[PDB]
Structure 1
Amino acid sequence: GAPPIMGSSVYITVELAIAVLAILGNVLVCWAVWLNSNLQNVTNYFVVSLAAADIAVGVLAIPFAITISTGFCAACHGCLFIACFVLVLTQSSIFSLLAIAIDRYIAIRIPLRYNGLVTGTRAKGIIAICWVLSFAIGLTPMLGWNNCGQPKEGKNHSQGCGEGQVACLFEDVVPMNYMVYFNFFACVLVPLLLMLGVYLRIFLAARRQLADLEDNWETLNDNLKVIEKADNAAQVKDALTKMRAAALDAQKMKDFRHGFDILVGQIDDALKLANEGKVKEAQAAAEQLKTTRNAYIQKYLERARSTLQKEVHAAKSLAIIVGLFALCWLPLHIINCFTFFCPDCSHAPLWLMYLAIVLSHTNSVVNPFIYAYRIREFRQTFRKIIRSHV
């Protein structure tokens, strides 16, 4: 077998390349949110916490990963910290990603209550709490769920380690049942399936809300046709009742309210004439709704449709971030599953183990590119920062 330093040099060089890109890209994200008030919303406070976790991957986790690949002799609980710290940052990333999904779900389901419910203060408290929990979850092996009590005495003696020391290798100190059941199934897989369900509900809400907008609009126009060719006052009354309900329903901002005030007032005018049996005069009054429809109602329809389409597109951009997180981390989890569940299968080869580790670290590079390609407000802030400075 080739000298280990050769393959190790490749892995270390690649890790350092990734640490540099993770730092720069996510420093740039944080710098953008700090400078641009348009980016200073509650959603982006989770984006920032997520960016800080990825900066920490380059500053600390990658240097730790480089250290543990050497198998150096170390006290077992110090080895555990080196080995498990990255699990803290990944758990924090899960919480930030989940809060973002719930944040956007709240914004599309109850937008009028959003600013009263989701505030910057409460977001900070949630973020602080999630970091605490991430340390508890990620460092759970440091509380006794480890293999420090069953050291590899063959490795420790050949490595020449001292009293209470072990050859510091990830799979010799971290239990695989912890990695599969606790970390993967419970703390990663379950939150990802929840995020999937949240985003599905976000898209269902938008689809259902866009459909109501268009259904109310068609109800308005169809009933105008009904009124125009109606043959008696009663056919006009029934047509006008179905419009008044749609008018009040669509009403549930200065020029918006004034438009529906005009609309409802004209319907009531036509309704009163129709109750008095004045057919032609009711039809002529109902015909004046077209003015209001073209001047006010069409502009509100188009503006409400545009907001909803923006929320769909934004939700897609954030879902892509969740999907790249899964793409980058699942191979490592899936390999552990094979290692744990198939003791009769050969262990995955070393070159694959480190490709899977490298892939997981690349996730801390991608998020700033998604923002730059998919979020105009980030892309524009990135340009101004770059060309004003570098």
Structure 2
Amino acid sequence: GAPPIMGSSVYITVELAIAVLAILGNVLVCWAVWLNSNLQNVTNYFVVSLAAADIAVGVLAIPFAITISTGFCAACHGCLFIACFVLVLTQSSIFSLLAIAIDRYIAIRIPLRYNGLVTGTRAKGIIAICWVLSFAIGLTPMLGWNNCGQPKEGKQHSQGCGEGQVACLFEDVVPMNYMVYFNFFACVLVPLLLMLGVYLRIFLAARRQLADLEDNWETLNDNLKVIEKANAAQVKDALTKMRAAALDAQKMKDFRHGFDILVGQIDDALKLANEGKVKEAQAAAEQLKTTRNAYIQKYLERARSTLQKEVHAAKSLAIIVGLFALCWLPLHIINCFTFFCPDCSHAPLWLMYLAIVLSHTNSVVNPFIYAYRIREFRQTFRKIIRSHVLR
């Protein structure tokens, strides 16, 4: 078994490489939102909170990981802080990702209430509350749910640690019942399933609304055929069904003018039908075809286009949740094997290190997803790189 420092040097060089990239990419997300008022919306205040957490992975969590890989002597509680700090940043990340999912759900379910419900001031209060709770949840072991009462006495003597000191190793100070039941099941796995459920409700809500728009459009076009097939109470029933469906599409000016004309043309055809002038009502009904073209088809296409953008945007933010789950799951599955299967062989050291590195890599990927999938970030990223790196 080779000298530890050789494999130690690979791990550390890789961790520092990740730290550099996590800082630069996330500082760019923050710089972007700062410079571009098109990126200054409540969704992006949670994107910045998540960027801040990923900066703190590079500045603090990776230096801590490096430090704790040495097994240096420390007072147990100072060891606990170094061991648990990254759990604060993961919890802060779960909260930001959950808030973004709920924000997007509100934006698609009740867009007319969104601006009055989700403001900057409330979003900042929520972010502040979520950072407090993330410190409380991630440093719980420091409240006394910890192995500091039961030091490894053989490691403590072989490394020449002093009174009160331990060999600082994550798995010697953080209980696995905490890491599995409390950190994984309650604080990570339940919130990811909840976010899965909200994204499912966004995609369904979008699909039902696109359907309703296609449906309304088909009633008009269908009922034009029901009118144009020569009875007068027959035309009345088709016209009564188009007046419901014109209203339902409605429920500023270029917009609200098309529908005024439309209900105008329908009520005109209605008056003729009540009187009983079938032929007049049929001619009255063909004017509508022209109002459909120059107005109604424009509203429909615009409503479809907005919903499709919400679907694409919601796909992009869900890719970010998937990549979080992917990057952290291996470390959680390893703790689950350690806890639930004490007869199972432990993961080799090299694979522990790979699981840790994969977890840090999550703090690099988000800036790439914004660059690839969101025009406004991408364009802002060029302006900033062209100005400040080109020059």
TM-score by length of 1: 0.99
**CA–CA distance in 1 between the matches of 2:254 and 2:151?**
74
What's the CA shift string for 1:336-365, capped at 9, x where partnerless?
Answer: 000110011011111110100000000000
For residue 229 of structure 1, report the CA deviation from its aligned partner.
1.0
For residue 26 of structure 1, report the CA deviation from its aligned partner.
0.3
**CA–CA distance in 1 between the matches of 2:350 and 2:293?**
66
For residue 291 of structure 1, report the CA deviation from its aligned partner.
1.3
**CA–CA distance in 2 between the matches of 1:90 and 1:125?**
19
**CA–CA distance in 1 between the matches of 2:87 and 2:166?**
21
For residue 99 of structure 1, report the CA deviation from its aligned partner.
0.3
**CA–CA distance in 2 between the matches of 1:23 and 1:253?**
45
**CA–CA distance in 2 between the matches of 1:96 and 1:168?**
31
What 5-or-longer segments of structure 2 have no aligned partner?
A: none
Q: Corresponding residue for 1:45?
A: 45
**CA–CA distance in 1 between the matches of 2:313 and 2:30?**
19
For residue 284 of structure 1, report the CA deviation from its aligned partner.
0.5
**CA–CA distance in 2 between the matches of 1:260 and 1:118?**
30
What's the CA shift string for 1:358-379, capped at 9, x where partnerless?
Answer: 0000000000000000000000
Q: Corresponding residue for 2:199?
A: 199
What's the CA shift string for 1:86-138, capped at 9, x where partnerless?
Answer: 00000000000000000000000000000000000000000000000000000
What secondary structure, in the 3-state scheme, does the structure 1 residue paired with 2:347 have? coil
For residue 5 of structure 1, report the CA deviation from its aligned partner.
0.2
What secondary structure, in the 3-state scheme, does the structure 1 residue paired with 2:346 have? coil
**CA–CA distance in 1 between the matches of 2:17 and 2:77?**
29
For residue 18 of structure 1, report the CA deviation from its aligned partner.
0.1
For residue 253 of structure 1, report the CA deviation from its aligned partner.
2.5
- After TM superposition, where is structure 1 displaced by more than 2 Å over at least 4 residues in a row? none
What secondary structure, in the 3-state scheme, does the structure 2 residue paired with 1:361 have? helix
For residue 245 of structure 1, report the CA deviation from its aligned partner.
0.5
Q: Corresponding residue for 1:316?
A: 315
What secondary structure, in the 3-state scheme, does the structure 1 residue paired with 2:74 have? strand
What's the CA shift string for 1:124-182, capped at 9, x where partnerless?
Answer: 00000000000000000000000000000010011100110000000000000000000
**CA–CA distance in 1 between the matches of 2:62 and 2:246?**
59
**CA–CA distance in 2 between the matches of 1:105 and 1:257?**
27
**CA–CA distance in 1 between the matches of 2:49 and 2:382?**
22
What's the CA shift string for 1:224-260, capped at 9, x where partnerless?
Answer: 0110113x21110010011011111111022111111
What secondary structure, in the 3-state scheme, does the structure 2 residue paired with 1:389 have? helix
Q: Corresponding residue for 1:159?
A: 159
**Mapped pair 1:138 → 2:138:** yes
**More deviation in 181-190 or 264-273?**
264-273
**CA–CA distance in 1 between the matches of 2:257 and 2:376?**
32
**More deviation in 131-140 or 285-294?**
285-294
What secondary structure, in the 3-state scheme, does the structure 1 residue paired with 2:145 have? coil
For residue 47 of structure 1, report the CA deviation from its aligned partner.
0.1
For residue 60 of structure 1, report the CA deviation from its aligned partner.
0.5
**CA–CA distance in 1 between the matches of 2:334 and 2:68?**
19
**CA–CA distance in 2 between the matches of 1:157 and 1:262?**
89
**CA–CA distance in 2 between the matches of 1:252 and 1:235?**
26
What's the CA shift string for 1:26-63, capped at 9, x where partnerless?
Answer: 00000000000000000000000000000000001000
For residue 265 of structure 1, report the CA deviation from its aligned partner.
1.1
**CA–CA distance in 2 between the matches of 1:179 and 1:255?**
59
CA RMSD in angstroms comes to: 0.5
What secondary structure, in the 3-state scheme, does the structure 2 residue paired with 1:95 have? helix
**Mapped pair 1:100 → 2:107:** no
**CA–CA distance in 2 between the matches of 1:324 and 1:315?**
14
What 5-or-longer segments of structure 1 have no aligned partner?
A: none
What secondary structure, in the 3-state scheme, does the structure 2 residue paired with 1:89 have? helix
**CA–CA distance in 2 between the matches of 1:84 and 1:42?**
29
**CA–CA distance in 2 between the matches of 1:252 and 1:163?**
73
**CA–CA distance in 2 between the matches of 1:348 and 1:124?**
41
Q: Corresponding residue for 1:331?
A: 330
The number of aligned residues is: 389
**CA–CA distance in 2 between the matches of 1:241 and 1:128?**
53
**CA–CA distance in 2 between the matches of 1:365 and 1:5?**
26
Q: Corresponding residue for 2:354?
A: 355
What secondary structure, in the 3-state scheme, does the structure 1 residue paired with 2:344 have? coil
Q: Corresponding residue for 1:381?
A: 380
**CA–CA distance in 2 between the matches of 1:18 and 1:191?**
26
**CA–CA distance in 1 between the matches of 2:50 and 2:377?**
15
